[PDB]
């Protein structure tokens, strides 16, 4: 009885007479005792947590701490994770879960009534399809609520109608799916790939859709992206954070760059605004926005003064002698008065081809400290045709002797030549200071004469001495254009900078020395930490070679401590386990992948609306008449030139070229380029709009496309859907404008191209919102998978804590049952065909040796087409259409036959399958008898453990022994004392396990060194997969040396023109002002991912915010939190304000994905619902991200193509007037003044 | 009405005496977790500060009057004390704290019933209670001008004659009451329904008036249990 | 001398990258109930700003804490006994709802449900969870002035800012930020305790975490005003006060709280401290509040002196904890190496949640610079948060103790530089602030590399203690509800007998 208690205690008292202490009961506490304990707990997620389950249900998580602990002298990673991380459990039963398959009901109306007048679902659906007014009924319905309870049965069914449909009709390639980051998820990734892949589908790209993807990185070393481990950042000594919020960004590893500050290391961040990563720093440098390479310009120049030539070190000296290409000899064209830097020299131009007979075009040529010319060895010939002379040892590759490369031709040129040189420092809007030299900016040069092999004579001179000249550097030949002093207004000094940036040149010169003589000191312990600040910039190229030449002047780059440092949205590592279960290449050979930027470019038709034309970004010493068109022109030329990819390929269904080849007596190869020549059949690509030449259904999972990661948001609503949007400025069409030279014009765009967009996911998103059938996907918590990153070398994985609640399915069972489906609903429209599929000059692989000296247009009639050289191959791959779900659940046989490898190298990999089948166990019969299963997402995920060389010490020396052929270096070593090692899925279960070192990456797993991208490099002397095999300083692909491009030179940030066509033309009576629109990575998700968790919601402004400095603020008579709109050309948004002071007076941020589907209310300005931060963003592609056919610049999917920059962008900002709702609630309010 | 006379007066005091004993008992023994005043102030604090010690002063006067007006013996003070001081002291001093109670009575009735916050988490107990005591505050001052007619103390004679008889358990206690006014008969029934109702309402925090604390040392601390 | 134990903790500020997410573990465990949703156990603020609740740290507004009188004794700023028994009826100081913010919710089923040929795309809208309402705009959450988010003006209101001429800071050149992630802090002279008129909140003796109980607890909402950190949430559901319980069930196993083991940045430090019990009021009535701080370590005990081990074993200190005191990160911070500080130790609370001040970017300057006595590193006069200001904060406004901190801090930086880089031992910063090689070697043990085993060293609550383990740990948690549970007494009225006890006795003595 409590209340007998009462009657009964107190002990001593204490502190004379302030306390007592009590002797009484504290049962009470058992409450919360009970309310911590909990069922069990289970490890999913690139941080494992911990999931713990009470009454049967996901309650809460917490990050795992039993990571494998790094090296004493480092701390550890335990325990990662972030805010956004520990509130997914949220997500499980929350009200905006997604529990069953849901579809529009217009569509399922007449789907129903279909199926009753079609027994056959394919001719049900063609009789949709076909009419015009029911086609549209539907199509309009979009984002227009009518979801409807449906059934898997149902929904399978009439996606595999409408697949087997359009593949019949139009082709394989008119069928896509869009997936992204497939590290968080590879097997969740991997199933809709997979179906896609087996059926011809196109697999659209997303690295350099988001513009994660760094061309520089391509460019300069020939890899899509490689970087340090965070544990790295702890080698360092000395870091700059620069554009790029670490902190709010890299959540999980910030601790390693704020702990390294107490082992002596000094740190620096360069951010326009106060950024949470300024917080951390010993310094903050506050450029504005958009004019980085400047800064980085005048950073190099001082270097190069200090370190390179006043005071030489000879640690750079011997760095930048064997791993850059500075020492390589660029040939000289001839001009007005002057000269202009041409292509590199190659073996071939010399008499005696330097001896080099295999691939002389192909390699390039430097001067030996003895005066005598040299083709050293790695340069990109000796890669293929030939073997043991791809390294970096520096030897003469003609007589196999070590010699010595010279930098400077200065003190024995034969004469000074003037060259010319492209300045665009003068150009640029009105919000951004310039400074005004000369268009072409005339150096003196030393040269010399060289006798070519064909009798002409022509000047050289080294990429080396091409640069100092290039940066500013007065070496002696009295240069007016030079610098006397830092002081000294030239190109690229700090007084230079100082006017472009307004930072002071005091501070760059300081740093610029600081940074160096540390990377002197340690050698080359100085690191550069780099984001999205700068890559999302059209010129990203300009801020990332700034930023890189910086490091490479400081011999940073291979060293651990050092280098480079991209991060971003992570990294598969384990990719050639991964790539033949994603892409089926282990069926059949090979996939339809697409670089998204330029697809969505074509198809949401934002190229009808370009008002930025490739002329405003020649070169000033270019042939402006011999690059003539609209920018999708010189897509459509690099398609057809086997540079980029194409989707769909051909204007003509790819499955009907086998046959008619078959009646014109030839067969289906040689027949496809004689029609190509002919007119025959064309590229899709020249008339996007005809009927059939664009895409049909797409499949969007793991991704929300539609209201986030989608640029040009209006755009894309209303050509690829068909329903409304808020588009404000007029086309090309309706403007004058030129139309595009290689396709077809018409004042009336076709819309609504999208017959079906089926959407996966476990929440209703915006993409679900526009879609037609959504399916009820698994949360991370509800399945099994696996996780690779960036950040660190462990991979863990997924698991089911409990079973997808209500009648959810794991992305993996999703794909296997339309697989299933579609194999028998296809009975009887397509059986064993055979398809005709091009694809582009691929990078890593002999191929990319295509055009070596110039450009030319086959259908120009400069040059034959001749597949894989000069237009991209023409396949041949038979498909087993009923055979699809046999071979989806099993691994193909051509992992056996024809073996398994990437990046450049190949193995035999048949013992890992005899383990497989093991494993996995076999096919009782069918199709696929005796072939090891794919059941499950665990099997799917032991075939990549069990294939991939990161994953398994057997498939790892394997894989070091193909490459030791073409280094002639035995690379073994790097994986023997790990041979026995093998990972499996239950293990990395028990804990994350650190994988083993690969020849697909730079860095390396070792217990002595941290993984440092370019180490593999600089000390197995491995060449960089480009042309001279060294870090390439000089671009000499005719599209680059003519786009201003050959050296990195400032690129003031473009203009968009989508302010003044529509400022002021829909006044609501509140001031207008136009301010730069950018839109970093936010703090309250990670891109829209849980931009609808309440938990976020609340810790962050209750929904979608925009962020104004307090002065344009109080221009524009805005309050904190006042309900403004956003708008331009592209569209409009809806939001409200966050006054502060951190963000400067010019720029705007509205943190990156925040969705459409809460908290908007009605636009002023387009009457509908307002939009989103891609409502006012376009695609507006880049020429140099199109090269292809040449080295380093040839195609992969994710490594090379067109990106998704935005950040150059320009709105219109003002408050609201009327805030309508819309939805018929009587709830609406009206803001004043 | 002789028998509705010996039900309510006679029977219905020991139902709701004994419902109210064993129900906050059982209450206190086996509802602690729902022991408590719950407070609305934060949701909104509007004419909280009045209106609830305007109601809480003035039903703190009645019943220090009441108390001490019928549980306290003739005998005690029966000169300096008669009957009819006690009366003069009942219709000015109670009838003052009456009018301060109904009005904080009344404007924490209006705001549990219309604003917004304390409606939408309220229970209907609450309600109920609040709207009882309102009522049986006006019922009490309306007794006030009918007293006023028996200035020689008759009829407090009579209702302090039941009261006594009830609380010492006399049976009969209802002749007491032969010929009071029926507005006492009112009051006497809906206060002793208080009394029912009591045990299952916010009412229980009364007991947990803190006065231990006037005289606690200032810091606590549980050893181990 | 009556020595007890406590598990305290140090946050380093430095390191915290004010991320949240011991805000959100938190409130996933403990507060994720309809009436605590709007209260943040653990919420973090991002500084300058007037916090949560707003303004908080206003004791004039909000009369929180202790206040010394002429006499020298102690009072509730609240008032005395009577003083603060007279406002009970309507707490005239408590703070109300929107002092934190109204909390909502969105109508996401819209999203779903919205019926075939909407006129418009549909959307969810916000709702108060306390109303049900439709909300025609959220115009306030829990972490609202997050990142500087909110004109200077507002954001300087901040109370840190007494006595500072804060006109400089509005220019965009000298903007600083910087984070106060905080919990209960878990007071030696708590001001709650002495707040609160039913006697239901109290420190526990053995590991000195102070909680509310929720059986005794009568909603009287009095100490909410007492807590001057306004740690205390009234539940307006159950009608009683819930607060941080410093996740005591984990404790007691030697487990960290969930805010610690989950903290990204790496940044919480869980250590034993021993104090004089018998010191708290005369530590605590200090005459100058300058005087605090100081009188707070006199409080605490050397774990390695022989004569506290014995008075601490004579007192009930089990040995592990007495161990793991030995070992206590929080005691190098606090004690040996002065860089752990408290938060206003002027409410006379006696905190036990410290705080390491943080560095911050050099403030802009004329030139480039030149190299200080650090080289390149920055000298503690060249940082741009104003030590003034951290004073305020930390240390009664008594910048003294703040510099010493942060000149060590950067002491540490000089000597790893000379050692990592030059190679060369240079202990001239070190003998400047008046360590030692070995002190600054063991900061950068635990500061830098801060392994787990060094950040956590949680020792047990030994419950099985003056209790009776064996016939709990046999029938603890069948809650089939034998209404037994809280009380000495055996009988009760509804005839029943616990369900973890043994009643039949033994006979064999
Ligand atoms: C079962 C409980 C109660 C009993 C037996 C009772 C009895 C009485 C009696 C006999 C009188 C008239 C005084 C006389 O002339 O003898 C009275 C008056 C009054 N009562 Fe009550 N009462 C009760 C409860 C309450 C309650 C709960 C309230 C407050 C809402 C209240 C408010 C008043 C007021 C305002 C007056 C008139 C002024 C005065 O005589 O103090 N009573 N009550
Ligand atoms: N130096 C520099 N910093 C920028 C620029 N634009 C934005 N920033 C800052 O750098 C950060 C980088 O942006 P965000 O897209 O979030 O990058 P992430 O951290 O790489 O994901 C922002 O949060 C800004 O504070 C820029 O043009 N230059
Ligand atoms: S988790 Fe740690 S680093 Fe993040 S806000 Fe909380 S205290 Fe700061």
């Given at each position: ?6 009657f ?48 049967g ?7 795992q ?46 789907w ?51 697949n ?101 290391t000094?740190?620096?961040?360069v ?19 958009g004019?980085?390479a400047?800064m980085?310009?005048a ?11 006043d ?13 850059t ?39 390039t ?61 003068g ?9 005004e030299l ?37 070496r ?9 002093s830092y ?6 000094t700090?007084?230079?900078?100082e ?8 501070q760059?010169?300081?740093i ?15 690191m ?45 590592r ?6 033949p ?23 949401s ?38 540079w ?5 390929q ?76 808020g ?41 679900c ?39 959810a399915?794991?992305?993996w ?22 398809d005709?599929v ?27 087409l ?5 237009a ?16 989806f ?18 193995w ?9 089948r ?39 020396v ?5 490459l ?40 390396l ?19 960089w ?23 990195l ?30 839109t970093?990575?936010?703090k ?14 609340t810790?962050?402004?209750g929904?979608?915010?925009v ?44 943190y ?60 219109v ?21 | 009405?002789q ?56 039903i ?12 306290t013996?003739?005998?005690?003070y ?15 001093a ?23 916050r ?15 005591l ?5 019922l ?26 009830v ?40 007991w ?18 | ?34 009436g605590?949703e ?9 500084k300058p ?79 108060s ?6 909300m025609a ?33 509005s ?7 910087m ?28 590991d ?11 909603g ?14 009234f ?6 006060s819930?607060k ?28 034993v ?27 605490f ?33 606090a004690?040996?190496?002065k860089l ?8 006379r ?20 610079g030149?190299?200080?006595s ?5 000298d ?38 000379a ?30 590399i801060?392994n ?28 089939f ?29």
């Open positions: 009885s409590k209340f007998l208690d009462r009964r205690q107190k002990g001593e008292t204490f502190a004379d007479g302030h306390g007592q202490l009590l002797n009484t009961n504290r049962d009470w506490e058992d409450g919360y005792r009970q309310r911590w304990q909990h069922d069990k707990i289970v490890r999913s997620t690139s941080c494992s947590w911990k999931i713990y389950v009470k009454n249900l996901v309650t809460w998580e917490t990050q701490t039993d990571y494998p602990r790094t090296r004493p002298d480092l701390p550890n990673h335990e325990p990662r994770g972030c805010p956004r991380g520990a509130s997914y459990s949220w997500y499980l039963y929350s009200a905006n879960r997604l529990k069953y398959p849901m579809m529009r009901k217009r569509l399922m109306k007449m129903r009534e279909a199926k009753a007048l079609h027994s056959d679902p394919v001719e049900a659906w063609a009789s949709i399809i076909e009419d015009a007014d029911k086609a549209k009924s539907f199509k309009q319905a979009r984002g227009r609520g009518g979801f409807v309870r449906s059934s898997w049965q149902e929904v399978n069914e009439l996606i595999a109608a409408s087997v449909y359009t593949i019949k009709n139009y082709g394989p390639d008119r069928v896509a799916g869009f997936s992204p980051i497939p590290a968080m998820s590879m097997v969740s990734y991997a199933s809709g790939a997979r179906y896609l892949s087996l059926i011809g589908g196109t697999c659209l790209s997303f690295y350099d859709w988001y513009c994660d993807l760094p061309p520089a990185s391509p460019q300069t070393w020939g890899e899509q992206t490689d970087v340090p481990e965070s544990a790295d950042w702890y080698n360092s000594s000395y870091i700059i954070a620069w554009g790029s919020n670490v902190p709010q960004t890299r959540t999980p590893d910030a601790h390693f760059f704020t702990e390294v500050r107490y082992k002596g000094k740190t620096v961040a951010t326009p605004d106060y950024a949470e990563i300024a917080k951390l720093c010993d310094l903050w440098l506050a450029p504005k926005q004019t980085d400047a980085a310009l950073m190099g120049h001082v270097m190069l003064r200090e370190f390179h030539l005071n030489p070190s000879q640690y750079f000296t011997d760095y930048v002698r064997r791993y290409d500075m020492p390589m000899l660029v040939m000289l064209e001839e001009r007005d008065g002057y000269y202009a830097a041409g292509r590199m020299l190659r073996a071939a131009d010399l008499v005696d081809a330097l001896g080099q007979e295999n691939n002389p075009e192909w390699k040529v430097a001067f030996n400290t003895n005066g005598e010319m040299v083709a050293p060895n790695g340069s990109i010939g000796f890669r293929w045709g030939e073997k043991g002379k791809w390294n970096l040892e520096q030897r003469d590759g003609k007589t196999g002797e070590e010699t010595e490369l010279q930098l400077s031709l200065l003190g024995s040129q034969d004469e000074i030549a003037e060259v010319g040189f492209p300045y665009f420092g150009d640029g809007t009105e919000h951004f200071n310039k400074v000369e268009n072409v900016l005339l150096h003196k040069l030393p040269v010399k004469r060289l006798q070519l092999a064909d009798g002409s004579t022509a000047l050289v001179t080294t990429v080396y001495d091409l640069t100092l000249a290039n940066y500013g550097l007065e002696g030949l009295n240069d007016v254009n030079c610098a006397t002081d000294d207004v030239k190109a690229y700090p007084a230079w900078a006017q472009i940036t307004g930072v002071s040149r005091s760059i010169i300081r610029a020395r600081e940074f160096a003589d540390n990377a002197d000191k340690t050698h080359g312990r100085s550069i930490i780099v984001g999205a600040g700068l890559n999302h910039w059209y010129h990203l190229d300009m801020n990332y070679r700034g930023l890189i030449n910086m490091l490479i002047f400081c011999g940073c780059v291979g060293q651990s401590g050092g280098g480079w440092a991209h991060y971003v949205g992570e990294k598969l384990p990719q050639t386990g991964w790539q279960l994603a892409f089926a290449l282990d069926w059949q050979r090979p996939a339809r992948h697409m670089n998204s930027t330029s697809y969505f470019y074509n198809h038709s934002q190229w009808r609306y370009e008002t930025v034309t490739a002329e405003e970004l020649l070169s000033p010493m270019a042939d402006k008449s011999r690059y003539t068109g609209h920018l999708i022109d010189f897509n459509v030329r690099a398609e057809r030139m086997g980029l990819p194409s989707a769909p051909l204007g003509t269904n790819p499955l009907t070229i086998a046959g008619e080849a078959e009646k014109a007596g030839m067969n289906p190869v040689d027949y496809t380029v004689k029609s190509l020549k002919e007119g025959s059949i064309r590229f899709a690509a020249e008339q996007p709009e005809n009927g059939k030449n664009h895409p049909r259904n797409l499949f969007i999972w793991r991704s929300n496309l539609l209201g986030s990661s989608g640029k040009g948001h209006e755009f894309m609503l209303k050509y690829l859907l068909g329903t409304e949007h588009i404000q400025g007029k086309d090309l069409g309706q403007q004058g404008g030129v139309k595009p030279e290689e396709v077809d014009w018409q004042d009336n765009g076709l819309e609504g191209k999208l017959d079906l967009v089926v959407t996966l996911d476990f929440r209703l998103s915006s993409t919102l526009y879609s037609d059938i959504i399916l009820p996907t698994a949360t991370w918590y509800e399945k099994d998978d696996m996780n690779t990153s960036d950040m660190h070398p462990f991979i863990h994985p997924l698991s089911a804590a409990v079973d997808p609640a209500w009648e399915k794991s992305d069972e999703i794909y296997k049952a339309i697989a299933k489906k579609f194999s028998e609903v296809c009975v009887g429209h397509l059986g064993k065909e055979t005709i091009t694809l582009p000059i691929q990078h890593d692989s002999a191929a990319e040796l295509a055009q070596p000296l110039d450009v030319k247009d086959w259908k120009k009639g400069e040059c034959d001749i597949p894989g050289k000069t991209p191959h023409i396949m041949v791959v038979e498909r087993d259409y009923p055979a699809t779900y046999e071979r659940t099993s691994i193909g046989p051509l992992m056996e036959k024809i073996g398994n490898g990437g990046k450049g190298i190949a035999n990999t048949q013992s890992e399958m005899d383990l497989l093991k494993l996995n166990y076999t096919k009782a019969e069918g199709p696929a008898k005796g072939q090891p299963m794919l059941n499950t997402a665990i099997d799917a995920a032991e075939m990549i453990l069990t294939l991939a060389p990161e994953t398994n010490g057997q498939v790892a394997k894989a070091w022994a193909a030791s052929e073409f280094t002639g270096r035995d690379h073994t070593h790097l994986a023997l004392n790990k041979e026995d090692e093998k990972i499996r899925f239950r293990d990395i279960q028990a804990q994350p396990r650190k994988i083993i070192s690969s020849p697909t990456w730079s860095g797993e070792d217990e002595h060194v941290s993984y440092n991208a370019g180490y593999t490099n600089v000390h197995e002397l491995i060449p997969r480009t042309l001279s095999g060294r870090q390439q300083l000089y671009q000499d692909h005719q599209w680059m040396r003519d786009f201003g491009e050959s050296l030179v400032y690129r003031p940030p473009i203009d968009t023109r989508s302010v003044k066509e529509v400022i002021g033309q829909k006044s609501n009576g509140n001031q207008e002002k136009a301010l730069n629109f950018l970093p990575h936010q309250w998700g990670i891109h829209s991912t849980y931009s609808d968790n309440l938990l976020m919601l810790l962050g402004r929904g979608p915010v962020w104004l400095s307090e002065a344009d603020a109080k221009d524009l008579g805005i309050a904190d939190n006042d309900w403004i709109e956003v708008f331009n050309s592209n569209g409009a948004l809806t939001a409200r304000a966050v006054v502060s002071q951190r963000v400067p007076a010019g720029m705007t941020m509205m990156h994905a925040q969705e459409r589907i809460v908290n908007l209310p009605g636009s002023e300005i387009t009457q509908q619902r307002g939009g989103i931060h891609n409502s006012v963003t376009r695609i507006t592609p880049k020429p140099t991200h199109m090269i292809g056919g040449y080295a380093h610049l040839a195609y992969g999917f994710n490594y090379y193509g067109t990106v998704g920059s935005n950040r150059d962008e320009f709105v900002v003002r408050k609201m007037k009327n805030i309508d709702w819309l939805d018929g609630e009587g709830n609406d309010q009206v803001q004043e003044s | 009405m028998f509705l006379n010996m039900f309510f007066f006679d029977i219905y005091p020991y139902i709701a005496g004994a419902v109210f004993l064993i129900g906050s008992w059982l209450r206190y023994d086996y509802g602690q977790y729902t022991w408590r005043a719950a407070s609305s102030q934060m949701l909104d604090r509007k004419g909280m500060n009045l209106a609830s010690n305007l109601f809480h002063i003035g703190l006067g009645i019943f220090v009057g009441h108390f001490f007006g019928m549980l013996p003739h005998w005690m029966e000169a300096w004390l008669p009957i009819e001081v006690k009366q003069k002291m009942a219709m000015f109670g009838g003052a704290s009456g009018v301060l109670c109904l009005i904080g009575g009344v404007l924490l009735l209006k705001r549990r019933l219309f604003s917004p304390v409606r939408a988490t309220t229970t209907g107990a609450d309600i109920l209670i609040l709207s009882l309102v009522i049986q505050c006006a009490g001052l309306l007794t006030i001008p009918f007293s006023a007619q028996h200035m020689d103390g008759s009829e407090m004679m009579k209702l302090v004659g039941w009261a006594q008889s609380v010492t358990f006399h049976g009969g206690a209802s002749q007491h009451l032969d010929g009071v006014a029926f507005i006492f008969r009112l009051h006497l029934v809906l206060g002793m329904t208080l009394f029912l109702l009591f045990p299952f309402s916010r009412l229980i925090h009364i947990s008036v803190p006065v231990e604390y006037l005289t606690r040392k200032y810091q606590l601390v549980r050893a181990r249990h | 001398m009556k020595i007890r134990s406590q598990v305290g903790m140090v946050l380093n500020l430095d390191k915290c990258i004010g991320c949240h997410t011991c805000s959100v573990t938190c409130k996933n465990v403990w507060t994720s109930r309809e605590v709007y209260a943040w156990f653990n919420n973090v603020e991002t700003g007037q916090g949560f609740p707003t303004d908080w740290e206003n004791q004039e507004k909000y009369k929180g804490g202790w206040i010394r009188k002429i006499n020298g004794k102690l009072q509730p700023r609240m008032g005395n006994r009577a003083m603060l028994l007279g406002k009970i009826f309507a707490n005239p100081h408590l703070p109300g709802i929107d002092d934190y913010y109204e909390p909502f919710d969105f109508d996401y089923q819209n999203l779903h449900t919205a019926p075939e040929g909407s006129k418009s795309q549909p959307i969810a809208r916000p709702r969870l306390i109303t049900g309402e439709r705009k959220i115009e306030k959450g829990p972490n609202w002035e997050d990142d500087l988010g909110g004109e200077f003006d507002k954001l300087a209101k901040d109370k840190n800012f007494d006595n500072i001429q804060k006109a400089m800071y220019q965009f050149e000298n903007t600083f930020m984070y106060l992630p905080r919990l209960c802090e878990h007071c030696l002279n708590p001001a709650c305790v002495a707040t609160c008129p039913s006697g239901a909140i109290y420190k526990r003796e053995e000195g975490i102070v909680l509310i109980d929720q059986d005794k607890c009568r009287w909402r009095m100490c909410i005003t007492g807590c001057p950190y306004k740690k205390i949430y539940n307006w559901k159950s009608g009683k819930e941080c319980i410093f996740c005591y069930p984990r404790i007691e196993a030697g487990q960290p709280t969930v805010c610690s083991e989950t903290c990204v940045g790496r940044i919480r430090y869980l250590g401290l021993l104090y004089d019990a018998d010191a708290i009021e005369r530590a605590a009535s200090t005459e100058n509040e300058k005087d605090l701080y100081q009188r707070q370590l006199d409080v005990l050397d774990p390695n002196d022989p004569k506290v081990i014995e008075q601490a074993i004579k007192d009930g200190i089990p040995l592990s904890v007495i161990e793991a005191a030995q070992q206590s990160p929080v005691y190098k911070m004690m040996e190496w752990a500080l408290p938060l206003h130790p002027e409410y609370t006696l905190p036990m949640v410290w705080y390491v001040p943080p560095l911050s970017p050099i403030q802009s300057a004329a030139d480039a030149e190299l200080g650090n080289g390149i590193l920055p503690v006069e060249s940082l741009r948060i104003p030590v003034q200001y951290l004073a305020n904060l930390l240390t009664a406004g008594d910048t003294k103790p703040v510099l010493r901190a942060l000149k060590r801090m950067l002491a540490m930086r000089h000597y790893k530089r050692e990592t880089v030059d190679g060369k031992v240079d202990t001239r910063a070190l003998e400047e602030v008046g360590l030692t090689e070995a002190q600054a070697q063991e900061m950068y043990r635990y500061l830098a801060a787990y085993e060094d950040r956590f060293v949680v020792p047990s609550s030994h419950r099985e203690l003056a209790r009776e383990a064996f016939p709990e740990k046999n029938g603890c948690g069948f809650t509800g034998d209404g037994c549970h809280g009380s000495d007494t055996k009988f009760n009225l509804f005839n029943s007998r616990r369900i973890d006890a043994i009643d039949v006795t033994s006979k064999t003595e």
